[PDB]
From a paper:
SadA is a member of the dioxygenase family from [name] [name]. This enzyme is useful as a novel biocatalyst for the (R)-selective hydroxylation at the C-3 position of N-substituted branched-chain L-amino acids, especially N-succinyl-L-leucine (NSLeu), to produce N-succinyl-(2S,3R)-3-hydroxyleucine (NSHLeu) with >99% stereoselectivity. One of the oxygen atoms is incorporated into the substrate to form hydroxy amino acid, while the other oxygen atom is used to oxidatively break down α-KG into succinate and CO2. This family of enzymes possesses a common protein fold, which is called the double-stranded β-helix (DSBH) fold, as the core of the structure, and an HXD/EXnH motif in the active site to coordinate the Fe(II) cofactor. The hydroxylation of amino acids is catalyzed by the ferrous [Fe(II)]- and α-ketoglutarate (α-KG)-dependent dioxygenases.
The crystal structures of SadA.Zn(II) and SadA.Zn(II).α-KG were determined at 1.77 Å and 1.98 Å resolutions, respectively. The structure of SadA.Zn(II) contained 11 β-strands, 6 α-helices and one 310 helix, and possessed the DSBH fold at its core, which was adopted in most of the α-KG-dependent dioxygenases. The DSBH fold of SadA was comprised of seven β-strands, four of which (β3, β5, β8 and β10) formed a major β-sheet and the other three of which (β6, β7 and β9) constituted a minor β-sheet. The β1, β2, β4 and β11 strands extended the major β-sheet. Six α-helices (α1-α6) were packed along the major β-sheet of the DSBH fold. The electron density maps of residues Ser60–Thr74 and Ala148–Phe152 were not observed in either of the structures. The data from inductively coupled plasma atomic emission spectroscopy (ICP-AES) showed that the concentration of Zn(II) was about 14-fold higher than that of Fe(II) in the SadA solution; therefore, the metal was modeled as Zn(II) substituting for Fe(II). Zn(II) is coordinated by the side chains of His155, Asp157 and His246, which are conserved in the dioxygenase superfamily. The dimers of SadA.Zn(II) and SadA.Zn(II).α-KG are structurally identical within 0.17 Å r.m.s.d. for 444 Cα atoms.
Author numbering:
A (entry chain A): 1 to 59, 75 to 128, 131 to 150, 153 to 273
B (entry chain B): 1 to 59, 75 to 128, 130 to 145, 153 to 273
Amino acid sequence: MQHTYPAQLMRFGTAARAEHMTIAAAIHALDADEADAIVMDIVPDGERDAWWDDEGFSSSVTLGQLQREQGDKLVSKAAEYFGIACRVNDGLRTTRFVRLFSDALDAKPLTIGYEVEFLLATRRVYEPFEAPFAPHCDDVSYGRDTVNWPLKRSFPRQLGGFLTIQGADNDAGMVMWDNRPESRAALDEMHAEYRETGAIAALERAAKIMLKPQPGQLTLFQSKNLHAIERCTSTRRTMGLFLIHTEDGWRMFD
Amino acid sequence: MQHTYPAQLMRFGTAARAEHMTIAAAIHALDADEADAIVMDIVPDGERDAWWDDEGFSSSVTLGQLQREQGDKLVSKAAEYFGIACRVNDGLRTTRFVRLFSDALDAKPLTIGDYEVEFLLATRRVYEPAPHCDDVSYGRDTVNWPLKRSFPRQLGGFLTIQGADNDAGMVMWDNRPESRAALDEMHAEYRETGAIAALERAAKIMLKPQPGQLTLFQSKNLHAIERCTSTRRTMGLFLIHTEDGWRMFD
Ligand SMILES: [Zn+2]
Ligand SMILES: [Zn+2]
């Protein structure tokens, strides 16, 4: 039997439901399309540093970075990505952060193929950047090189999960819109519309959820929805990964 | 003081030479284009199984296999190849077989990459009862193959552990196909006509590696393994002499 934690469950256009839930229950609600985001109070004050300094992080290419590459550069970056994951996952799988999900869901690292593992998770440092802050979505199928990207299947309930460790001075958080771009090319066009026009005209019609996750909070959300992290005024630290629910069970990757 | 061994040194059209050399000296003779192959007596008759059974092999995608993949399957098969190399190379580094080269040449695994990751070091091969050549740059999917430099003195190196009863060996021709497309074209001629016309009057070397012998050769030359009547077991890798030093991969 599992720990329950204070949770706020958010759906577009609706007041947040406040409940005490297990991690597996929050993840089930998302996978059932019963929530767009859930924010949970996981780590109490004073214990936040221990999750970051966890010895399993000790010893970085992300899948989102791998997806940007094309042709021979995608072959060479895939070699870096998969070669690295194997060096670092032995440590990551022991982290309290990764164990949150392996325990709750019986999750395992996503594998390709012999089977070799995707990278499990990343610690993320956000340094002050004076920009709009950047809207993107995460979908394991969204390689820029459509032909040569080898994960061609989309999971409509793919989740992002990140635990906030240090918050920015200005309390920088996340905006999530009711908009799901259909492909990497669609996001890539949206980026060009932003840089030229300062805006994304399609968004002025979309409902948005603004989230300000605090130190110790885990934010779980449907990562296919467009979203963006606000400009930070000082250092923000988070740890995160993504989840997909496969025929063989829950799988984790970053 | 490094080990010294009996070596036979072959060169197209010239008499086989009998020398006695270190592994480093044999490799440097090939790398100076002063031999096409060298066969050396390395492992004494009582000791061959122990090389096969080295604990460093306790743990199957090769570079040659990866080369034949195209498009998304190339990216997927590359993920498998580099992922496996990460798993197994720490063991492989400790094997007597890999150490022949890392000791002789200060060789290291070939790397690719912002972060450097290793190619697979070596493989043990079991043969149970079409000529080709090996060049690191000869991926079939040329636009997507990331290794663009050809090394003219690329070597293959294999130690024979168990020989076939019919004493099946290796033939090399003085013929160096210029890309994977050239090789695939010759394959289409062998299949469609029953030989490769260009090879008829080409100089050839016939090798008959025995158990305990190391065969080092210039792998860009077309070559073929003769058909075996019984089980043949070998351990093998390739060498290229890069800007950074000698690098091993399979
Ligand atoms: Zn995201
Ligand atoms: Zn060969």
